[PDB]
Amino acid sequence: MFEARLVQGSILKKVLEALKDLINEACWDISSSGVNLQSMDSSHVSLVQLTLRSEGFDTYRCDRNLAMGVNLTSMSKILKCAGNEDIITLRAEDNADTLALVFEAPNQEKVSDYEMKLMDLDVEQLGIPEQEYSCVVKMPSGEFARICRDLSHIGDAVVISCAKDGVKFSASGELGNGNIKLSQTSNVDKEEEAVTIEMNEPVQLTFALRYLNFFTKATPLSSTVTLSMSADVPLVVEYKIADMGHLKYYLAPKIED
Amino acid sequence: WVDKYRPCSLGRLDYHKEQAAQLRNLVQCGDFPHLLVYGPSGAGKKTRIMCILRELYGVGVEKLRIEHQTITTPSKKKIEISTIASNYHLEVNPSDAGNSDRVVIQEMLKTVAQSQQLETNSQRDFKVVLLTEVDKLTKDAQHALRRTMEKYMSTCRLILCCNSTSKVIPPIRSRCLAVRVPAPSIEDICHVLSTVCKKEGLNLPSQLAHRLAEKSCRNLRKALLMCEACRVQQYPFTADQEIPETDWEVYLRETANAIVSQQTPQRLLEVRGRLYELLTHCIPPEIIMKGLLSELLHNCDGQLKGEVAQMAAYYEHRLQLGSKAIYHLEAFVAKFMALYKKFMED
Amino acid sequence: KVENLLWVDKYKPTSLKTIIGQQGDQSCANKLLRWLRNWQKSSDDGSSFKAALLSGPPGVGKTTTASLVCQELGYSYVELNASDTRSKSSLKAIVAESLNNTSIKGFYSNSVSTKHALIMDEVDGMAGNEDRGGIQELIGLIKHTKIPIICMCNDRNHPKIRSLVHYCFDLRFQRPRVEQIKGAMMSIAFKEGLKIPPPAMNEIILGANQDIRQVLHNLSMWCARSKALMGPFDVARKVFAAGEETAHMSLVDKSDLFFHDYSIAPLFVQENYIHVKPVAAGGDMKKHLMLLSRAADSICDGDLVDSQIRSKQNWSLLPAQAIYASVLPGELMRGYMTQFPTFPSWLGKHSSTGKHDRIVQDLALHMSLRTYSSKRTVNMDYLSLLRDALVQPLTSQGVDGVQDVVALMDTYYLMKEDFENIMEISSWGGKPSPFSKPKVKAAFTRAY
Amino acid sequence: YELPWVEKYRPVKLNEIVGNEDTVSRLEVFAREGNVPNIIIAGPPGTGKTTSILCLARALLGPALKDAMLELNASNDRGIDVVRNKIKMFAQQKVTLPKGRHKIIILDEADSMTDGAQQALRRTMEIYSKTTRFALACNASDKIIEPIQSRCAVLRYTKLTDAQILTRLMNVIEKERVPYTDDGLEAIIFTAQGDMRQALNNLQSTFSGFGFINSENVFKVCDEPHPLLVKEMIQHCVNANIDEAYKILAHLWHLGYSPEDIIGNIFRVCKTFQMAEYLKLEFIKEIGYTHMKIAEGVNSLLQMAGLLARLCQKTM
Amino acid sequence: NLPWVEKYRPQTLNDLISHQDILSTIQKFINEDRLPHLLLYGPPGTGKTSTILACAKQLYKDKEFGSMVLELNASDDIDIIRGPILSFASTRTIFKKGFKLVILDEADAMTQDAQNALRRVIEKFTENTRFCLICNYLSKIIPALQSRCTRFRFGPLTPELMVPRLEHVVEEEKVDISEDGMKALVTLSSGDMRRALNILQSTNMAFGKVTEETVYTCTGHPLKSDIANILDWMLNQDFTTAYRNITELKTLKGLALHDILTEIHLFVHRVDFPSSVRIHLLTKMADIEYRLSVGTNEKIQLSSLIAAFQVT
Ligand SMILES: Nc1ncnc2c1ncn2[C@@H]1O[C@H](COP(=O)(O)OP(=O)(O)OP(O)(O)=S)[C@@H](O)[C@H]1O
Ligand SMILES: Nc1ncnc2c1ncn2[C@@H]1O[C@H](COP(=O)(O)OP(=O)(O)OP(O)(O)=S)[C@@H](O)[C@H]1O
Ligand SMILES: Nc1ncnc2c1ncn2[C@@H]1O[C@H](COP(=O)(O)OP(=O)(O)OP(O)(O)=S)[C@@H](O)[C@H]1O
Ligand SMILES: Nc1ncnc2c1ncn2[C@@H]1O[C@H](COP(=O)(O)OP(=O)(O)O)[C@@H](O)[C@H]1O
Ligand SMILES: [Mg+2]
Ligand SMILES: [Mg+2]
Ligand SMILES: [Mg+2]
């Protein structure tokens, strides 16, 4: 039996509204170490890796390593039934067909125990190796979301150029051209908004904006987004969780001529 | 060169000159009516129609294109049709849609009527919707044609190019000026052949042109093709050329001769194979029946010809009611064998 | 141990040398393999296309062919079935940004291989209001792509697909010959421990119309009936017998013989009634011919009833048809079948007629200078004279075949495909085309 | 509210279906071993298609029938959107069944699905065949597109002989103790025409309206042209007596029997009649011709009288 | 003003005539709460939509009649089944306890797919909604659907039964009806009380008196003497003078060839022939009718009919 009680319930909610539009159905790999989720977009262009460590869950109990396929749309539809203050308890039997989610209101007698129906998913874990990226840009999440949502109005392809002095996003569409250059920030009081660009070689890649806008749906997860990027490897948009794990999005570059 | 010497102006026609002057007077006066032009195949209905269009609109009626429209049946069986169109007319054959000929008429007439509302100013205030092969429209489609012909009378005129109007509803015959294009005489065919060869600069003699005319059987296109085909093989033109005939004429003739030769089921099976080879090449069953019946009547007795003629008429009639033509063709053959053997033996 | 898998999945073609249909030099699977292997040179004479269109009858191996081809070359494909919505908006929001993009399977593999391709299966299912504007956006994607799109259809002669074939390398799967499927299914039935007489195997393969999936499902049901311890050919042979059905059959039974497979029984009877020798007509050919004519009359009456039932769905005339097309001829031809109840062979002739029809219609539409007749013999005689026009220059002089072929091909707006169509279209009686009756044809395809 | 006999006596296991011994034998084999293929059961109405599929699904799954079976009637929305969402999410759904058992998706009235729905159902049938099995039922097996028949075993069903309907009718009578007589049972079997559900419905309606079952009473609730009158009319036509056959014909026309009904009964009676053989065939030919002419729309009494005149002049 | 086909409608269930067995059985069904789905079929004007409406008004009240009875015509439109019918049958009515009633008039104009859907709807909700289908051709109804429900053939009304109601209507109104005007009304009605009352009212309102001549002129029905004249021209004249006479009569009054042919058939059966001649007349007339059904010239078909009669 796998039972995981999480007091910070909202996290789950947010995560599922972060994936439910990029991924349609995923395979939660539960183990005594935590919860992992590696899942490729249906068009084989974007990959997502979620990790929630067992030390972040208020109570964690996994006996045998489960691998439960869920329909992330159905899971989001179930989790939308929980208030932002609820204590969420996932529970699943040895090899059950259903996953019981118990939302307990914090200070009431209202306890709502739903029972989602798992699906059959035969996915293979892609092997992503630990890399040392050329350009790592740690910026505020809202900043990146604004950048992507703005450039989506101009054109449907963002050219990211990570030079020495600062990163520069660019786009060109039938109504004109635009480019947001983003300079590194100084050692000024607030820490979260301090842009931090650590580069080794000036890289330049071209990515699709549809998937970047799918990525930015996880901005409420954390305030700082980390863009790792090297030549001819997928962009790595990483959002930390509140000391529970992380959520990384790999986006593959456009075809260069 | 069949398409290389066909005239393009009503004053340039080779035969039926009084009718040509009449048609010119018609297009000259106002309010061009709905025309129903008919007459045996290969007599010049399309030539006269194209000349009428050249007299009606400018010469821009020759710079045409080929549009491919899709129609939807009262179910999901989608059908695709071919409309040859110009800047002032549209020639569609609303019969390839086998039994969905009622919707193509409505939709095409509607589309042409609405396109004429987009600044038709060249010389006339209407367009022409030339429907070829009208006598094969279903009655439910001819009724729609009747309705949508008046519904959009003011903006588009119709020219129905059929032959042997016998299967055209009187409601239509009463709303179209009947232009009748007879088959040109033997002498007219001879004169147009001599004219074509002289413009070609050839030596077409006076005894070969007459053989071409008598073999063409008042069909001008057949005569022109035979003249062109006796040149691709033996340019010098003598009095006794072996003027060729199309492949299927020969096949249908040898099939009839085979039916006449033997009267055994082992022969009837080979005749079934021949009828399949004929049907597969998409030649109409009525043509098969008429061509078989002729060569058969050439090999019967005067007392038997009546029964055979009535048998062919009966079977052909029934074939126009069923779906699989090979059934009725083979039945006709089997019946003729059973009759001819009993006649010859006895 | 119980099996949780069908035969259609136990004995699927796990490799490429196992596709029963095509293992030849230039077949639908090797042509596609060679078009894919050197697709990079695009961005057979099909190296100029950006997409393939595998089309043909059901159950022949199109899906398996495309999957195994994309799998042998290390490609990685994204299949889009008909159970996936593919309207214009959905299509250009799902697969638009993936065509000119790199696949993440190209970096992270569990070896690593680039060359991502797309597979658009069941492209003729993109019909109806749900998939509104699918084919238009699909050709708009094919026009601007950077990865090989492999579209699969089911009937190339479709209105929506006719606007798509102009952009796709056109492959066409043939129904596999009966001997190939026979060898394969005999090997399979041997693996399974099921013994079936080869005649019954030929019967099963023919009744299923050489549909390998259907013959596999039929073998499964056969083995099921075997473990439990009347086909079309059998009933078609039981209607023209004499000696055993004297008291065994009545009008109800003879009328029921039609109802076993009432959709195909009349065709079987019309095909096999001619190989019978009426016991009533004891060798007297004058009576045997008369019985044949009477049976033919009855079969035409059955055809009339059939054409009447088809139009308005009036299933109350089924007994009348059973009387005209199956019982009557029986009593008229009640002798002894000679050889075998051969297949009706009318469906193939109707399909070939539809092919010749559309071929002639296309060739005639290109000759729309100032003359046209949709599909009549008017065009069959223009096109016979065009075939004798074309072949003449080359028959008589090798040096003028090119000049005249081009002059005519461009005077009437014709192409090389049109040439091939006009050549083996007017071959009556299996007569060889006057173009194979040598050295100039090689330079003829290369210089055109 | 008591439920009808068509349901109170519905067979709950395949040993009680009397329809087609060979096909039901195949299905019992499948209910024993357990690895069914996608099956399309096609046949005339009332013969036990829905019942066979339901009993097969029950015997396969067992107590997981609430969890592993999805039935979709003709009264349910089965457009392309339902086929792409509900049926697909059920095929993908995980249910743990014994070794050889599979989930079952019963699409009753499979001939009522539009082509788009079946096209969207093809690949769902094909992909998930490792855990999901489909069981379609239909009457017109040509309304199902060819690619769906290519991935199904097409099990044919045929009408029931009179003996089978009689056995089941006696099994029901024994349980209900309804007073009957042989002529009444022959009347019910004549009005049934193979439909085993029609026979039961007529039995229950007759018993509930009147009680005792006799032919006089059976033809008081069915009320089609009494086969004795039609037999007498055909007999007069055999003796070349037109003026005495038109008598019965105009009598039947007086009571307002539609000519389609008159021709249906004339055919069904002239088929199993006691004439010669050649004469019977010469009669059935003309009756078929007139049936064609009436289905086409020429349904006046003059056409029936012309049919009688032809039948008379066949026997000089 | 108000038509007599509505003023004299049978308001109760016993005011129905000529169907005493069916009416008694339906009344017994009502008394015992055993009312099954009903299929009322038969020729027009015989009392179907009145039988079921009387049964309804006996079953519900007049204020429950809007929320528990769905009177739906089937000739307006598969969507009608899963639409209003499935949404009416599946839902309860809030405060009323008891089944509902759905009355599908013209239930044979439904396509076969709609009848499959409706058969499943019926089979499902069979204890809170009773269906009553109404049709003229039971042959048009799918055998599946008809199996579900008990069938009642409302045949035509014999003239003995229907004459008393016409006599009551005549006495209640003021119609000076002759002793044969009633006969020429019963004959032309052909056994549907609606047409009988309609013809009677319209003729009494147009001419003012009903007799054997006035009704024949108000309905334009070909008089018996005219058809006798035509048969005499055909039977006792030259071919050409019969063609001329028949054409002149056929154009004098509005007369087609279908009606000529029908009446001439009835006469062929009336008058005495050698009984081997009427086999020929009947065959030829039944072929001429088929020939006319396909849209042919009537000038060649009339001549064919005269040729048929020239066997004499
Ligand atoms: N050439 C073949 N060789 C071996 N098995 C075959 C072959 N063709 C079909 N099969 C079998 O039939 C099954 C289905 O074949 P598919 O290739 O899926 O048919 P299909 O061409 O997709 O037909 P559609 O999609 O209905 S038009 C496979 O799983 C194989 O078991
Ligand atoms: N072969 C049979 N053996 C026993 N009872 C049968 C048989 N066929 C039908 N029945 C009875 O008839 C009832 C209805 O039969 P169904 O299984 O509904 O037939 P069906 O094939 O569904 O007919 P449709 O769906 O209208 S085409 C069942 O509840 C049984 O009581
Ligand atoms: N048995 C009857 N008793 C009394 N009046 C009747 C009877 N039958 C018909 N009528 C009268 O005829 C009129 C029409 O009868 P309806 O019941 O409407 O016939 P109908 O069966 O509905 O015909 P349809 O709907 O066109 S098939 C009614 O208004 C009554 O006045
Ligand atoms: N007046 C004419 N002068 C010369 N050739 C003609 C004339 N009329 C018809 N033709 C010949 O007939 C050919 C086509 O006949 P067409 O006009 O199509 O008649 P139909 O429509 O009956 O076949 C033309 O290409 C031309 O060769
Ligand atoms: Mg496939
Ligand atoms: Mg059923
Ligand atoms: Mg009514």
Short mmCIF file of N, CA and C in Angstrom, two decimals, chain C residues 90-150:
data_model
loop_
_atom_site.label_atom_id
_atom_site.label_comp_id
_atom_site.label_asym_id
_atom_site.label_seq_id
_atom_site.Cartn_x
_atom_site.Cartn_y
_atom_site.Cartn_z
N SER C 90 -7.27 21.99 -34.54
CA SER C 90 -6.60 21.00 -33.71
C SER C 90 -5.34 20.47 -34.39
N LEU C 91 -5.41 20.26 -35.70
CA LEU C 91 -4.25 19.75 -36.42
C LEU C 91 -3.12 20.77 -36.43
N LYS C 92 -3.42 22.02 -36.74
CA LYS C 92 -2.40 23.06 -36.77
C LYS C 92 -2.06 23.59 -35.39
N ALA C 93 -2.63 23.00 -34.34
CA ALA C 93 -2.21 23.29 -32.98
C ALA C 93 -1.51 22.11 -32.32
N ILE C 94 -1.58 20.92 -32.90
CA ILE C 94 -0.91 19.75 -32.36
C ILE C 94 0.35 19.41 -33.14
N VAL C 95 0.25 19.35 -34.46
CA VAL C 95 1.32 18.83 -35.29
C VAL C 95 1.95 19.90 -36.16
N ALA C 96 1.56 21.16 -36.01
CA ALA C 96 2.17 22.21 -36.81
C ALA C 96 3.57 22.53 -36.32
N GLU C 97 3.73 22.73 -35.01
CA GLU C 97 5.03 23.03 -34.45
C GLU C 97 5.95 21.83 -34.33
N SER C 98 5.50 20.64 -34.69
CA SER C 98 6.38 19.48 -34.61
C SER C 98 7.03 19.15 -35.94
N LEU C 99 6.49 19.66 -37.04
CA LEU C 99 7.00 19.32 -38.36
C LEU C 99 8.38 19.92 -38.59
N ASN C 100 8.57 21.19 -38.24
CA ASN C 100 9.85 21.87 -38.43
C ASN C 100 10.61 21.96 -37.13
N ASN C 101 10.52 20.93 -36.29
CA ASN C 101 11.16 20.90 -34.99
C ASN C 101 11.98 19.64 -34.86
N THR C 102 12.81 19.58 -33.83
CA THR C 102 13.60 18.41 -33.53
C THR C 102 12.86 17.59 -32.48
N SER C 103 12.87 16.27 -32.65
CA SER C 103 12.21 15.41 -31.68
C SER C 103 13.12 15.17 -30.49
N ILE C 104 12.52 15.10 -29.31
CA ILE C 104 13.31 14.87 -28.12
C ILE C 104 13.75 13.42 -28.03
N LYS C 105 13.11 12.52 -28.77
CA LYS C 105 13.64 11.17 -28.96
C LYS C 105 14.99 11.18 -29.66
N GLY C 106 15.35 12.29 -30.29
CA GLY C 106 16.63 12.43 -30.96
C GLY C 106 17.79 12.71 -30.05
N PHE C 107 17.52 13.09 -28.81
CA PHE C 107 18.55 13.36 -27.83
C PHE C 107 18.58 12.32 -26.72
N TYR C 108 17.44 12.06 -26.11
CA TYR C 108 17.31 11.19 -24.95
C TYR C 108 16.66 9.88 -25.38
N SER C 109 17.46 8.86 -25.61
CA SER C 109 16.96 7.52 -25.85
C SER C 109 17.38 6.59 -24.72
N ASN C 110 16.54 5.61 -24.43
CA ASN C 110 16.83 4.66 -23.37
C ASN C 110 17.54 3.42 -23.90
N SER C 111 20.04 2.76 -29.78
CA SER C 111 20.73 3.93 -29.25
C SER C 111 20.01 5.22 -29.63
N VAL C 112 20.63 6.35 -29.28
CA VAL C 112 20.05 7.65 -29.60
C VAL C 112 20.10 7.85 -31.11
N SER C 113 18.98 8.27 -31.68
CA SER C 113 18.90 8.39 -33.13
C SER C 113 17.99 9.54 -33.51
N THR C 114 18.46 10.36 -34.43
CA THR C 114 17.63 11.41 -34.99
C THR C 114 16.69 10.81 -36.04
N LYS C 115 16.22 11.64 -36.95
CA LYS C 115 15.31 11.27 -38.03
C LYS C 115 13.94 10.90 -37.51
N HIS C 116 13.25 11.88 -36.96
CA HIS C 116 11.86 11.78 -36.54
C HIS C 116 10.92 11.96 -37.72
N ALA C 117 9.90 11.12 -37.81
CA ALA C 117 8.93 11.16 -38.90
C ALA C 117 7.53 11.18 -38.33
N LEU C 118 6.56 11.51 -39.17
CA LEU C 118 5.16 11.57 -38.77
C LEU C 118 4.36 10.61 -39.62
N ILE C 119 3.37 9.99 -39.01
CA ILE C 119 2.53 9.00 -39.66
C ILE C 119 1.08 9.39 -39.44
N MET C 120 0.38 9.70 -40.51
CA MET C 120 -1.00 10.14 -40.46
C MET C 120 -1.84 9.00 -41.01
N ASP C 121 -2.26 8.12 -40.11
CA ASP C 121 -2.97 6.92 -40.49
C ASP C 121 -4.45 7.23 -40.64
N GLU C 122 -5.11 6.45 -41.49
CA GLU C 122 -6.54 6.58 -41.74
C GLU C 122 -6.89 8.02 -42.11
N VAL C 123 -6.31 8.47 -43.22
CA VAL C 123 -6.49 9.86 -43.62
C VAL C 123 -7.84 10.09 -44.27
N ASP C 124 -8.54 9.04 -44.67
CA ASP C 124 -9.88 9.19 -45.20
C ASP C 124 -10.93 9.20 -44.10
N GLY C 125 -10.53 8.96 -42.86
CA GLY C 125 -11.41 9.17 -41.73
C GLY C 125 -11.53 10.61 -41.31
N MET C 126 -10.71 11.50 -41.88
CA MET C 126 -10.78 12.93 -41.59
C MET C 126 -11.94 13.55 -42.36
N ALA C 127 -13.13 13.02 -42.09
CA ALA C 127 -14.34 13.50 -42.73
C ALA C 127 -15.39 13.76 -41.65
N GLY C 128 -16.42 14.49 -42.04
CA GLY C 128 -17.45 14.89 -41.11
C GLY C 128 -17.19 16.27 -40.55
N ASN C 129 -18.08 16.67 -39.64
CA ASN C 129 -17.96 17.99 -39.05
C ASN C 129 -16.88 18.04 -37.98
N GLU C 130 -16.59 16.91 -37.34
CA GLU C 130 -15.59 16.90 -36.28
C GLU C 130 -14.23 17.31 -36.82
N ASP C 131 -13.80 16.66 -37.90
CA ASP C 131 -12.52 16.95 -38.55
C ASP C 131 -12.72 17.94 -39.69
N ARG C 132 -13.34 19.07 -39.37
CA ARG C 132 -13.62 20.10 -40.36
C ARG C 132 -12.34 20.79 -40.81
N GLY C 133 -12.02 20.66 -42.09
CA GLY C 133 -10.83 21.28 -42.63
C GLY C 133 -9.55 20.54 -42.33
N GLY C 134 -9.60 19.22 -42.23
CA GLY C 134 -8.41 18.48 -41.90
C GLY C 134 -7.50 18.32 -43.09
N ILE C 135 -8.07 17.91 -44.23
CA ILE C 135 -7.25 17.61 -45.40
C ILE C 135 -6.59 18.87 -45.94
N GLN C 136 -7.29 20.00 -45.88
CA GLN C 136 -6.70 21.26 -46.34
C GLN C 136 -5.48 21.63 -45.51
N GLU C 137 -5.62 21.60 -44.18
CA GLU C 137 -4.47 21.90 -43.34
C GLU C 137 -3.39 20.85 -43.50
N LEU C 138 -3.77 19.61 -43.80
CA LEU C 138 -2.78 18.57 -43.98
C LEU C 138 -1.93 18.81 -45.22
N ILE C 139 -2.56 19.20 -46.33
CA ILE C 139 -1.74 19.49 -47.50
C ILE C 139 -0.95 20.78 -47.27
N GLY C 140 -1.50 21.72 -46.50
CA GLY C 140 -0.74 22.90 -46.15
C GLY C 140 0.45 22.61 -45.27
N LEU C 141 0.39 21.52 -44.51
CA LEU C 141 1.54 21.10 -43.72
C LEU C 141 2.54 20.35 -44.58
N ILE C 142 2.05 19.51 -45.49
CA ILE C 142 2.93 18.77 -46.39
C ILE C 142 3.73 19.74 -47.25
N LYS C 143 3.11 20.85 -47.63
CA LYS C 143 3.81 21.82 -48.47
C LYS C 143 5.01 22.43 -47.75
N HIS C 144 4.90 22.65 -46.45
CA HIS C 144 6.00 23.23 -45.68
C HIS C 144 6.31 22.28 -44.54
N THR C 145 7.14 21.28 -44.81
CA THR C 145 7.53 20.31 -43.80
C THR C 145 9.03 20.12 -43.86
N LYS C 146 9.57 19.54 -42.79
CA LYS C 146 10.98 19.20 -42.77
C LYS C 146 11.20 17.80 -42.22
N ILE C 147 10.14 17.02 -42.04
CA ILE C 147 10.24 15.62 -41.66
C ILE C 147 9.30 14.81 -42.55
N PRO C 148 9.61 13.56 -42.85
CA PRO C 148 8.77 12.77 -43.75
C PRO C 148 7.42 12.45 -43.13
N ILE C 149 6.36 12.89 -43.80
CA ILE C 149 4.99 12.55 -43.43
C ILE C 149 4.57 11.32 -44.22
N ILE C 150 4.02 10.33 -43.54
CA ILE C 150 3.61 9.09 -44.18
C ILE C 150 2.11 8.94 -43.97
#
